[PDB]
Paper text:
However, the observed helical conformations of CSP vary dramatically. These range from near-planar discs with a shallow pitch and large helical radius, as observed in 364 and 227, to extended helices with varying helical parameters. Each of the extended helices in complexes with 337, 334, 311, 356, and 239 are right-handed, while the partial, disc-like helices of 364 and 227 display left-handed curvature. While there is a range in the level of inhibition, many antibodies are highly potent and have statistically indistinguishable protection relative to mAb 317, namely mAbs 356, 311, 334, and 364.
Numbering used by the authors:
A (entry chain M), D (entry chain A), F (entry chain C), H (entry chain E), J (entry chain H): 1 to 52, 52A, 53 to 82, 82A, 82B, 82C, 83 to 100, 100A, ...
B (entry chain N), E (entry chain B), G (entry chain D), I (entry chain F), K (entry chain L): 1 to 94, 96 to 107
C (entry chain I): 25 to 64
């Protein structure tokens, strides 16, 4: 019954900022890591960010380094990703994703929002 | 970082058939390669992890194997609800997905 | 973590350790490791 | 021989204040964490608050957040819970509880007091 | 928080019988769920921790097992001093207790 | 040749304060943790305190928490134990002790002083 | 904390006799239990650590074993200068000593 | 495909200061370690400095200790090396290098820059 | 630090000939030794790592083996695009490169 | 080829202060731990002090605790050992030493200096 | 700390014989014991580490073995440049050097 939802999408002018959110339930949110995988329509997906289960450390892909901030709020079972200095090529359908228990893959994806520039 | 390649990028088959999807990579892995399924407009869901083990709820028709830089995903007795775009993934470095192979009804 | 272990640990080793390696380690793996198990 | 006793029970007016105490003996109270677990009679239990062994960390349930204060006094082996703005739904049998050595579960419960509004 | 449910809420048995209690919850744990006992008017006492291990002073008749979301308590050779309300608990998140099941005389 | 000697013993009225000491020799005192263990004559012993080798950490028994103070002086190779508001039940023989090398036990005990109330 | 128990509290034995001393605890440890000796009026000295290994200078006659909550001290072919009070200890939690057992001449 | 380029070359008088730069692309620069390997023409190579992927710790060869400062800036995927008090024996071709994935060797070398005194 | 030695410092061979380069070190390593290549004026590229495994993209002609203080690089069927200076490296301590062995046409 | 030398020896009045130095060359001094080992003429050796490679940690033998200060200078490849309140017993030959790469022993000894009281 | 003992404290032997030196310690080590050499008036230089491994440059004549509380150093075919004093060391705790055995010409 692991379910995820995403919000905060829409259209933002280039150079603007937008803050996504990923509500969680059906799994121990504080006991799992989080991913943000985005898919350009008609293309393959590209990894963007990962945050550890406790939120201690965090990584990004080279294309988003220095502009994206991924943070966790374990109390509200909520995942965030703050995009600053948005640019045109980032227009894609972002997805929330959970870490698998055994091997650090992504098992179940949320429906995700669509963001344009 | 790792780079991933898929072939064929478009495949045609009918119901009850048997197909393969070849996933080739650089920087040989042999362990940490996935598979996936994304219905049109639907969020992708895990299909095979560690390239040999099925995920819970996945039918036994799906089979994966491979090592080194050569991996395959084999579907026997193709059914209508399996027609989707199967992807590929690796974990030895930063996760980079494949281009995507589509199965289209013959 | 509200359910983190709240007990005290007085049984930890209280000895000094001057015998640890005093050499610098410059050839330790300097790559990032985002592939470590991120679960609990 | 873990001996736990609770006092300070009785009847208070709604919106009033009451202050509970939990004297402890038979174990090194100075280095163990404490719990408060309450039981509405005829129903199940519901956890209230946890205080760390050193007293630095403390948590509460959402229904009691911002109204109940849990404190420790390691010198006299006594655990407190300051109760503010009591309401009719708070009437229940309150138990003092002891953290296990291995996992942060609860082993030994004192007889507890009944608080009525 | 974690939602805890037990079934059946009331059971009837005689002395020397063999009884099970099912503890079902969401928020899959597989590791950390407890078992308890509460005589009427008495403070609860721990019976099984880590869902597989007994607390000191608990006789060997008590046994528990389970993983995922399916957890059970096994009581063999039921004795008169065991007739109480066995509760349930977990720790993987903020602690929440079950509704409570009571064993009666048949 | 681990030699340990203790001084400062004797008699004192209840409610007073007395100051023990434990000179050490034959081993690297500055690189080892210490202890204080007491035995009531005719009975077994009970742990009292522990001090880390550098002096950062220190624990106490529940019956002596908040009343006893344990301190070190690495330069003078001397242990200490400050007792305040001493009560009648504390009459016992006070031993100095040294932490073992491998496993954090107590290995060599000094002859110890005798204290009464 | 851990509570410690010994038995027998007092034992009578002759020179060259082989005796065992039982050390029973709660909250099973199986590794961190000691064995001690205290001559009348003398400071105690360590005898066995890790419950299986002898301290430097201890003769081979002394032997210790045990796991869980059950432990024993094995002394073989008793000597006259071994007649003292053997104490017991643990280190998993705050250190707690036993009650004390005495070996006496018969 | 991984591309490394170096700049800031030329000739500077002995005792002066000169700052190099190494832009990188085609790989996750924020997640890999850097190096500076120099080669005196007609001679073998000699290692100079290494900086960890996150930029916490950093080392140098004995002949360059205290005069060279190696630094990163993950935002623009750029590696730097601040040379101070340059001497005649330092005239050589300086190479940018990336740490390998598995074993901490060097795999891909940039074409290098010319520094003379 | 480790000091590195190479032999021969200059070697000559024709096209299709098979050559060997010996890399002897002090303070035996047995694992961590590389091999390099540097055509005149171009940046060096890795050829063998862990002294037994080829870097991706190099042909199977290159071969490395050895342990202790002695290591070798063997090139079979030498081809005209392999006439360059092969270096040597180690990682157990601070990286210090060899002196350089150059292959010439004969 | 590793070369170590020592200076600052001679004669000093008892209770005075003296500062030894150990110049090093031929090895990466900035990345190795140091030692001071002394030998009373005609007798066996006895360890005195150790300092970590970066200089964070430092230890001493119990016979010299609190009286000797061991310090480094990575830039100048120089060891130092500050002596305070010298006693007639301290007259011995003082050696410099380098930690082995793998096992924390002493590998190469400098020729050493002679100090008398 | 540890305390170190070697025997014999003085040994006499000609050129070309075999000499063994026994180094005994308290608080059994079995791993971390050295062997040394100090020519009269010269700085001592390492000979054996881990009691079995030879330092680079030391000929194969020197051999060491032992574990527990006893260790030995074996010199085969004693040569004129070997007539010196061999010391002993350990590294489990604070380093303490033994008394030193001197080899003399017979």
């Amino acid at each position: 019954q692991v379910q995820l939802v995403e919000s905060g999408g829409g259209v933002v002018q280039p150079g603007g900022s937008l803050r996504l959110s990923c509500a969680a339930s059906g799994f121990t949110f504080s006991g799992y890591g989080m991913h943000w995988v985005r898919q350009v329509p008609g293309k393959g997906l590209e990894w963007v960010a990962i945050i550890w289960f406790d939120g201690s450390q965090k990584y990004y892909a080279d294309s988003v380094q220095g502009r994206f901030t991924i943070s966790r709020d374990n109390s509200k079972k909520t995942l965030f990703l703050r995009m600053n200095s948005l640019r045109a090529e980032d227009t894609a359908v972002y997805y929330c994703a959970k870490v698998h228990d055994d091997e650090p893959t992504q098992d179940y994806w949320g429906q995700g929002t669509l963001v344009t520039v | 970082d790792i780079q991933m390649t898929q072939s064929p990028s478009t495949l045609s088959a009918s119901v009850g058939d048997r197909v393969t999807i070849t996933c080739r990579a650089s920087q040989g892995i042999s362990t940490s390669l996935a598979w996936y399924q994304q219905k049109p407009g639907k969020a992708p869901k895990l299909l095979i992890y560690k390239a040999s083990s099925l995920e819970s709820g996945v039918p036994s028709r799906f089979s994966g194997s491979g090592s080194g830089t050569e991996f395959t995903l084999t579907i026997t007795s193709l059914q209508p609800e399996d027609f989707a775009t199967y992807y590929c993934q690796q974990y030895k470095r930063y996760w980079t997905f494949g281009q995507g192979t589509k199965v289209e009804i013959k | 973590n509200p359910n983190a272990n709240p007990n005290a640990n007085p049984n930890a080793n209280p000895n000094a350790n001057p015998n640890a390696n005093p050499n610098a380690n410059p050839n330790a793996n300097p790559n990032a490791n985002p592939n470590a198990n991120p679960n609990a």
